Design an enzyme around this catalytic site. Structure first.
Site, PDB file in Angstrom:
ATOM      1  CE  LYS A  65      39.226  51.490  43.849  1.00 49.72           C
ATOM      2  NZ  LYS A  65      39.494  51.302  42.391  1.00 49.72           N
ATOM      3  CE  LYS A  99      42.027  55.180  36.207  1.00 50.34           C
ATOM      4  NZ  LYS A  99      42.304  54.114  37.200  1.00 50.34           N
ATOM      5  CD  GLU A 118      35.890  53.267  38.030  1.00 48.11           C
ATOM      6  OE1 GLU A 118      35.463  53.718  39.114  1.00 48.11           O
ATOM      7  OE2 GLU A 118      36.977  53.622  37.535  1.00 48.11           O
ATOM      8  CG  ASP A 155      36.507  50.873  40.509  1.00 50.30           C
ATOM      9  OD1 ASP A 155      36.335  49.880  39.767  1.00 50.30           O
ATOM     10  OD2 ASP A 155      37.507  51.616  40.436  1.00 50.30           O
ATOM     11  CG  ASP A 159      39.704  52.441  35.281  1.00 48.95           C
ATOM     12  OD1 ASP A 159      40.587  52.687  34.438  1.00 48.95           O
ATOM     13  OD2 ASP A 159      39.892  52.610  36.501  1.00 48.95           O
TER      14      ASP A 159
END
Ligand SMILES: NCCCC[C@H](NC(=O)CCC(=O)O)C(=O)O
Ligand SMILES: NCCCC[C@H](NC(=O)CCC(=O)O)C(=O)O
Ligand SMILES: NCCCC[C@H](NC(=O)CCC(=O)O)C(=O)O
Ligand SMILES: NCCCC[C@H](NC(=O)CCC(=O)O)C(=O)O
Ligand SMILES: [Mg+2]
Ligand SMILES: [Mg+2]
Ligand SMILES: [Mg+2]
Ligand SMILES: [Mg+2]
EC number: 5.1.1.-
Lengths: 369, 369, 369, 369
Positions: free
Chosen positions: C163, C267, C218, C191, C243
Site C-alpha cells: 500500500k 469486487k 493498481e 496499490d 480498482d
C-alpha cells in the site's frame, strides 16, 4: 466563524396530487432539512431531497449519512470556506450528492445572511430578472394530460413539460393529444425519464414528433448510456437534454467529449449543492451546452437555492423548480408570480422558515454537536 | 450600488534588473491602473499589464480600449454583478483580456471592501494557507544563471524557474549548469516561452533533460500550436505546461479535447480577470489538469488579485506572481515571506495603495464619468 | 420458495492492527450482516462491507437502505430467481452495490444449501483448485514495511501487495526497501489507492520502478479518471490494474472502449454481489482483460462469496480476500492454507456462522418481515 | 459425478414444407443428437443442428468432430463443471460451436435433472413468464407470402418474420404485399440472410420500407462485413439486427466497438451452447444491445435449451425457436401455446425424449466410451 450544531429533520412534504413519471409514482416527497447553527448566532437552512432512482440515495440513508458521516467532521468548521467544506466532505465520502447538497445550501444561506446579500450576489451576482415557469404534467392517458394542460393554461401557464415513457406508441399519442389541445403557441418539452431505454426505440419515437414543435427531448435512454445519447444526436435534429445521465463533472466530461447533448439538467441534488452546480455550469459553458437548473420536486429551501444559481448565470436559460407549487404545505415561503419566477433581494436564500410547519412535517430528527 | 467614475493611470513600474525571456527583454513594466469609484464612496483598484507578445494588447492600446470602449458603458453599472459586467464587456468587444481584467479586479476589490471580506472569501473561501515562492531566472549565460540561483538560494529561495529558448544546445547547457550548481534538493522548472518552436526541436531537447529532475517544461512550442503540445506529450514522460497557448476557455476546450497538457498557466491578464480565471480553473478540474496562477510581472494590485484566486482553489497547486519582488517601486504593499507567500485577512485585495507612488509612476491619465 | 424474513445486523469486526491506505486508516471494519429466512426453513447469510470512499455507502447508510428500501419489497420473493431479484432491487434504487451485495450473497447461500451444492457449482462449476494468498502491507515507513514483509515471509507468504500513495518520492523509497529486503523471488504488486492522482505524477513514479520487478500498479489515479489510466497505459510497459475506477458495467464499458487497463479488480461490494460480479467477468473476458476478485476486507461471509466467484472462472487469475486473516474475531469460519486458499465442497458458502460471535459484535439490529 | 458414455445419433427431422431462405432451401433438417450417460445414472440430451452456411459445420462433420475429437476427452469429466468442460473443448479444438453446443446442452440437462430444477433456474432463474411466438415465412412470390401470413393469422399468429433476399425490387414487393394483406396491427420483421450483400443495396432497399412499419431488418449484408452494418446504421433509423455476422464474443466485441447493431440474434449453435450464450447476453447488456435467442430450426432438445436461456434474462426480449412447429416428427415434446411460448417447471430441459422416434429418424450412430 464556526459551526456549532447541525439540526437534522426528516420530513415529508404533502403533494396535492401524486407525481407520476416513467420510473415511479410519488404520493408525497420525503425530504431532509438541515438547520446549521454558528458561534455567531447566524443560522442557515439546507435541504436534501433524495431520489433513489437517480443518485442511489434515499430519505433514510441521507438522514444517517448526514448524522453519522458528514456532520461530525463539520462541527467547528467555517461555513464561509465552501471550497474547503466540500473538500472535507469529499475526502470523507465519495458521491452522496444529495446529502452534501443539504450541507452546502445551509452554508450559503449563512454566508448571505452574514454578508447581508442574496446568495446569487455571492456566486456571480444577478444576471437574470425573471424566468418563465414550466408546468410539469404527470403521466396519464392522452386526454387526461391534454385536459390538465388546458386547465393550467387558464391559470396563466404558457410552458409545459410532458412526462412520458411507458410505451412509444402511447407516448406519441399523449404528445399528439396535448399539442392538438393547446395549439402551436404553447411551449412543450418532453421528458421520458429513461423510458424508451435505447436509441432504436428513441429514434423510432422521434420519427413521429417532428411536426409537433417539441422544444427538446429529455433523457430518452437509460442514465448510464451516454453513448446512446450521442448516437441519437447524430441522427436527429430535435434538441436533446440529459438529466439522470448527468450528475457530477465525471459525466459532464463524457458528455462534452462525446458531443452527447444540446442541453443538460443541472440539479443541486445530483452534484452536491450550489458550489458544484456553479462548476458544472462553467464546464458546460466551455462546450456551448445550454443549461437548465431542475429539481427533484423540493421545498422552498432547495428550490430557492436552485434559483439563486440560475439567476446568476447567463448559460442557465431555463429553470424547473416547482415543488412549492405542488405541495399543499411548505416549510418555506418562496413566492412565484406564475407564469414567472422572480427573486427578491433578501439575505441568503431570501425566504422565511415556518418552525411550526417544519415540526408538523417532521417524522424524526436529531441534533449533532 | 453604481459606478460613478473610473480613473485610468498609465504607469511604468521600474525593474531592478531587465527581465529577459525568449521573445523579448523588458527594462521596466508598463501597466494600466484602474481606480473605480462608486455612488457609495467605496473605491476599487484594478490593473492591466499587457504583454504584446501574448494577447496582442499593448500599454497604450489598453489605456485607450478602457477609456473609449469599455468604461463608458460601465458607468452606472453595479460592480457587484460580475457576471453581468463581463457580459456587457464581452458584448462590447471581443478579446482584450488584459483590459477587461483591469475592470474585473477593481470590481472584486470593491465587492470585498463593501462586504468587508478578502476577495478569496467571495470566490470559494480560503483553501490554501501558503504557497512556496519560485524565483524566476532571466535568460543569461549558463554560469551567470547558475550564480544567480546560488545567490537567491542564500536569500531563502528553494524553487526556481529557468528562462530558456534561444538555442537547444545552449539551453541544455544552461539547465545543466544550474542543476549542477544548486544540487538535487532544489526545485527547477523550465520555461521556453515558445523558443523551441516545434515538437522536433522540443523532443530533441528533452532527450538531454531526463536526468536533471525538471519539475515541468513550460510552453516549448509556438502558442497557436496545441497539436504540437499533444504530440510532444505522447512521446515524453516529463510534465508539460501550456502558457501562451492558453488564454480563454476556447483554448482550454482544445487542450482538454486533445490531451495536450499536464498543467496550465492561468493568468488574469490572459482571460479577463478573477471571474474568468475561476471558470478556467473549474474547467481544468473536470479534466484533471493541474493549474498554476502565473502573471505578466505585475504590481501588488494584479498580483494580489491572482493570489486571491489561487488561495481559493484546490486545483491551483502553484503560483507565479513575483512582480513586487522584482520592482524597485510598487504602488501597492503586498507582503511576501520568502520563500513563502501568505495572504492577510483584510477586505478586498487586502493591500494599501500609495497615492504618491502612483502619481510618481504615472506618465499620463484620464478620468471617465 | 419464499423469503419470509430478513435479519439485519450492524456489526464491527476487530482488526489485529489498523489497516492503513492512501485515503484512510481503519481501526476496525464495520459490516452489515444479512440473515435471510425462507418459508422452507433454509437460511442464507449475506454481508455488506461499505467503503465510503469507493461507492458512497456507509455502515449506517447501508443498514437503513436495506431495512427501509431493499428488504420490504423482497419479502415473498423467491431467492432462486436471482435475475429477478436484481431487477427488483435495481428498479427500486440505483447504485448501492454494497447493500445489494448483502442480499445477493444470502440468496446464493440459500440456493446452494437448497440444492446441496457449493455456490461455485451454481455459477459455472469448479475451475480452479487453489489460489496463492497475497499479504497486504499497510502504509508505513520503508523500513517498517520491509520488516513486516520479512516477518510474513517466515509465515509462508510469497506474494505481497504494498500500500503506497502519500508522496511519489517516499512511495518509491518504500518499494525499493521492500524489494531489497525480500529478494527477487518474492512477488510484489503495488496499490496506490488513487494517491498519485494524475498521469504526470504516475509516469514520474513509474520511471523509478522499472528495475524492481513489480507485477502490476493498481489505481494510481483518481477513480473517476479512466482517461488518465488509458494515457498512462499508452506510455508505460508495467501492467495496470483499475480498482476504485471500476464499479459497475458502466465503467467496464469505458475501460474496454478506451483500452484503459490490463487488469481489473472486481469486487462484490462494488457491483452488487455474485451475480453482477459474474457478468463483469464475462464482459472483461470479451476484451481479454485479466480479472481479480478483491474485497474491502470482509468477514468469512463475503470473503467466501468472493472466492466462489473466483474459483469458477478461468478469467479470474488472482484473489484478494484476506479479512478473516486480519480480524481477531470472525462470525464465519473460512479456512485458509497460507500461502494458499482452497475451497471445501460444502453447500452454499460452505461455512458455519457462530451465532454467539455475531451477537457479540452486533451494535444494533432489526428484523424485516 | 463422471461422464461414462456419450451416444451420438445422426438424424434427419422431417419438414412439413421446405424451409427456403436467401442462401438455401431445406427439404428437412439433419441434426446430431447427444445422449450423455453418467456414473450416477443421470442421462442428459444435447443437440447440434449445423448450418454449413453460417459456421462452416455440417451434419456429417459435426458427428465426426464429436466422435473423434470432443467426446473422447470428455469421458470421466464432471458435467457439472461447465466452465471446465468448455475450457477443455476449446483447448482441444477452436470453433465448432455447433458440436460444442450439443455437449453443453446435455451437460445442463444432467445438471438440472441432478438438482431437480429447470435449466433456467441454474443460469439466473426465471425472469420471463412468456414470449410471443413469431411465424417465419419462407421466401416465395409476394402474393404467396401474403396468403400464408393471412392463413397463419387465423391460427392465432400475430407476429411474422419475412424471409427475403433475392432481389431488392422483388423483396420490396414481397414486404409491401404482406403488410397490405395483414394490416398495421400485425408485427413484421424482415430477415435478408445476407441477400442485399452491401450497404448501397441495403440503403436503397430501406428507402422503400419506411412507411411499412417494419420492427427491424436482420442481416442485410454479408456476414463478415460488420463495417457495412455500422455504415448502414449511421444512415437509417430502422432498427438493425445482426445474425450470421455474430457467432462468438469475437464478433460481439467488434459489434460493440463499432456500434454496428441495435439487436443481435444469439444462437446456441453459433456460440457453443447455453454457457457461451449467457456470456454473450451479459456482454450485449453492457452496451445496451437488445438480444434475441434464435435457432437454426431445431428439435425440442435444442429449442428447449434456447428457451431456458431466453426465459432467464431480461436483456433477451424476443425468441425464435420454432423447429417443433415446423417438423412433422420430433424426438422431444416441447409444448407451444401459440401465439405464446411458456416453459413448464420440470427438471433439466423439462421435456421427454421418445426413444422410438429417435431411432426412427436415425441414419447412423455410435457410442463413445
Ligand atoms: N424525485 C421525484 C421525481 C422528480 C423528477 C424530476 N423533476 C421534475 O420532473 C419536476 C421538477 C420541478 O418542476 O421542480 C425530473 O426532471 O425528472
Ligand atoms: N510581460 C513580461 C513577460 C512575463 C513572462 C511570464 N511571467 C514570468 O515568467 C514571471 C511571472 C512572475 O513570477 O510573476 C511567463 O510566465 O512567461
Ligand atoms: N475498506 C477498507 C479498504 C480496503 C482496500 C481494498 N482492499 C485491500 O487492500 C485488501 C483486500 C483483501 O486482501 O481482502 C483495496 O484493494 O484497495
Ligand atoms: N439452418 C436452416 C436456416 C435457419 C435460418 C435461421 N432461423 C430461422 O429463420 C428460423 C428460426 C426459428 O424460428 O426457429 C435464421 O434466423 O436465419
Ligand atoms: Mg428529467
Ligand atoms: Mg510562461
Ligand atoms: Mg485496490
Ligand atoms: Mg437470421
Amino acid at each position: 466563524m464556526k459551526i456549532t450544531a447541525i439540526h437534522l429533520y426528516a420530513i415529508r412534504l404533502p403533494l396535492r396530487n401524486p407525481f407520476v413519471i416513467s420510473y415511479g409514482s410519488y404520493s408525497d416527497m420525503p425530504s431532509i432539512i438541515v438547520k446549521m447553527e454558528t458561534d455567531e448566532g447566524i443560522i442557515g437552512y439546507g435541504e436534501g431531497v433524495a431520489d433513489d432512482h437517480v443518485t442511489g440515495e434515499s430519505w433514510e440513508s441521507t438522514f444517517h449519512t448526514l448524522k453519522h458521516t458528514l456532520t461530525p467532521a463539520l462541527i467547528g468548521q467555517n461555513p464561509m470556506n465552501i471550497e474547503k467544506i466540500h473538500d472535507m466532505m469529499d475526502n470523507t465520502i465519495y458521491g452522496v450528492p444529495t446529502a452534501k447538497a443539504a450541507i452546502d445550501i445551509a452554508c450559503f444561506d449563512i454566508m448571505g445572511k452574514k454578508l447581508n446579500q442574496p446568495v446569487y450576489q455571492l456566486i456571480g451576482g444577478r444576471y437574470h430578472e425573471e424566468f418563465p415557469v414550466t408546468h410539469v404534467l404527470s403521466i396519464a392517458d392522452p386526454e387526461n394530460m391534454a385536459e390538465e394542460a388546458a386547465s393550467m393554461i387558464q391559470k396563466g401557464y404558457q410552458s409545459f413539460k410532458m412526462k412520458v415513457g411507458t410505451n412509444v406508441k402511447e407516448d406519441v399519442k399523449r404528445i399528439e393529444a396535448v399539442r392538438e389541445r393547446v395549439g402551436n403557441d404553447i411551449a412543450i418539452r418532453v421528458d421520458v425519464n429513461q423510458g424508451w431505454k435505447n436509441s432504436a426505440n428513441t429514434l423510432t419515437a422521434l420519427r413521429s414528433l417532428g411536426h409537433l414543435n417539441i422544444d427538446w427531448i429529455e433523457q430518452p435512454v437509460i442514465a448510464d448510456d451516454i453513448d446512446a445519447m450521442a448516437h441519437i444526436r447524430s441522427k436527429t435534429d430535435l434538441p436533446l437534454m440529459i438529466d439522470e445521465g448527468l450528475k457530477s463533472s465525471r459525466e459532464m466530461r463524457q458528455i462534452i467529449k462525446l458531443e452527447a447533448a444540446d442541453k443538460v439538467n443541472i440539479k443541486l441534488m445530483k452534484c452536491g449543492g450550489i458550489y458544484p452546480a456553479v462548476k458544472l455550469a462553467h464546464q458546460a459553458e466551455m462546450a456551448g451546452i445550454e443549461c437548465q437548473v431542475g429539481s427533484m420536486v423540493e421545498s422552498s429551501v432547495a428550490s430557492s437555492a436552485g434559483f439563486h444559481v440560475a439567476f446568476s448565470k447567463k448559460i442557465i436559460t431555463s429553470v424547473e423548480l416547482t415543488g412549492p407549487l405542488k405541495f399543499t404545505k411548505d416549510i418555506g415561503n418562496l413566492h412565484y408570480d406564475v407564469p414567472f419566477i422572480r427573486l427578491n433581494e433578501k439575505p441568503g436564500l431570501g425566504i422565511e422558515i415556518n418552525e411550526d410547519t417544519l415540526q408538523e412535517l417532521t417524522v424524526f430528527q436529531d441534533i449533532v454537536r
